[PDB]
From a paper:
To evaluate metal-ion affinity and to identify protein metal-binding sites for Sr2+ and Cs+, a class C β-[name] ([name]) [name] [name] the moderate halophile [name] (HaBLA; molecular weight 39 536) was chosen as a model system. HaBLA, although a moderately halophilic periplasmic protein, has a particularly abundant content of acidic amino acids similar to those in extremely halophilic proteins. The crystal structure of a halophilic β-[name] [name] [name] (HaBLA) was determined to resolutions of between 1.8 and 2.9 Å in space group P31 using X-ray crystallography. Seven binding sites (site 1 to site 7) for divalent metal ions (Ca2+ and/or Sr2+) and one binding site (site 8) for Cs+ per HaBLA molecule were identified by X-ray diffraction studies including anomalous dispersion.
NQ-HaBLA was initially crystallized with Na+ and Ca2+ and the structure was determined to 1.8 Å resolution. The solvent content in the NQ-HaBLA crystal is 43.0%. The r.m.s.d. on Cα atoms between the monomers of WT-HaBLA and NQ-HaBLA are less than 0.5 Å; therefore, the [name]/[name] mutation did not significantly alter the overall structure of HaBLA. The crystallization of WT-HaBLA and NQ-HaBLA required divalent metal ions (Mg2+ or Ca2+). Both WT-HaBLA and NQ-HaBLA crystallized isomorphously, and both contained three HaBLA molecules in the asymmetric unit. The structural analysis of NQ-HaBLA shows that there are up to 11 locations for Ca2+ (Ca1–Ca11) in each asymmetric unit. The binding sites for Na+ were not identified in any of the measured HaBLA crystals because of its similar electron density to the O atom in water.
Author numbering: 8 to 364
The structure:
Amino acid sequence: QTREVLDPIVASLMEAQQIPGMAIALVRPEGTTISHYGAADRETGTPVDDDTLFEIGSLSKTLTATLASLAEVEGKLDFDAPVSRYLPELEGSAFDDISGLNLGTHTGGGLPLFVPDEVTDRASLMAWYREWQPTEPIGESRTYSNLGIGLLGLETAASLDGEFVPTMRAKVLAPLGMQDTWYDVPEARMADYAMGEDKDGQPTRVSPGVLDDEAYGIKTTAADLAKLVRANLHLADVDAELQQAIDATRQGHYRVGDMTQALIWEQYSLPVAPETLRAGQGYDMILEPNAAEALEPPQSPRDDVWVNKTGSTQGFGGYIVMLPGKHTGLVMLANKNYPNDARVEAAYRILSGLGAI
Ligand SMILES: [Ca+2]
Ligand SMILES: [Ca+2]
Ligand SMILES: [Ca+2]
Ligand SMILES: [Ca+2]
Ligand SMILES: [Ca+2]
Ligand SMILES: [Cl-]
């Protein structure tokens, strides 16, 4: 059916990219279709199924954004306020001049991509933030930053008077029914935890690290990510405040060339060419500063857009696409870090084959 469109495209993709296993969710009005392909671990051959956990890498950032947005809806976090208003340990630093919004849109003054090696824990991280000098004009330049979205998670946790993961669990994951979503995979689920395969065909699994939970640490199922997508598409029955928080994550905040930066979510007006999508996931967007123009007639969530986010670790590659105007979404998780361009092509062919574009 829907499977007749999906199955050949994923077979072709997994063959071409030598991906051991995939889990895919297709979200539409009148329902969600879950499909599993291949092996969760190439070296045991254990199949991908309902319980298989995939590393989603930077897709974790969408959950971080959602929690921040919920704190904002609850009146506990002001997105345009200086981050030092909620983390007074950073008073007198650059974070007097950088907001939660800047952090959620990668416009925090050129804040760098990676946590530096001299930062090993929360104390050394805060010391590093206190000393750091902005290298770009705050709110006028975008640099993709684990440090920034990480700090947004810490700011959110402070504003909610709780710790990041328990707070995430209580306020976002549990209400969405995301009960297969883990920051630290329990012993009892280790048999479900897919093994990654890197670009050389070697097994690999993500290591813990500072700001891991906020930036890249989730292991989850396609089905759980589909719940977050369903809610984004107004197809879920969720509490009003959570729904509002989720809707606000899709508000466009900056124009960045052809891309609109929402709260972590990245979006494009329809029709969108795949080449534009590809440009969004390459060196020039991800590894250079890009000029960013605040959207000052501040836009409402749009119904005529391609909304997306990639996520990877060394051994995994995930992609989410949402088409709010079609009430359709796609979640693709793989245990190989395969090229972003191939993620775009496969998503586009699936969605075109389904008539959604
Ligand atoms: Ca304000
Ligand atoms: Ca390092
Ligand atoms: Ca952690
Ligand atoms: Ca204004
Ligand atoms: Ca092609
Ligand atoms: Cl990092």
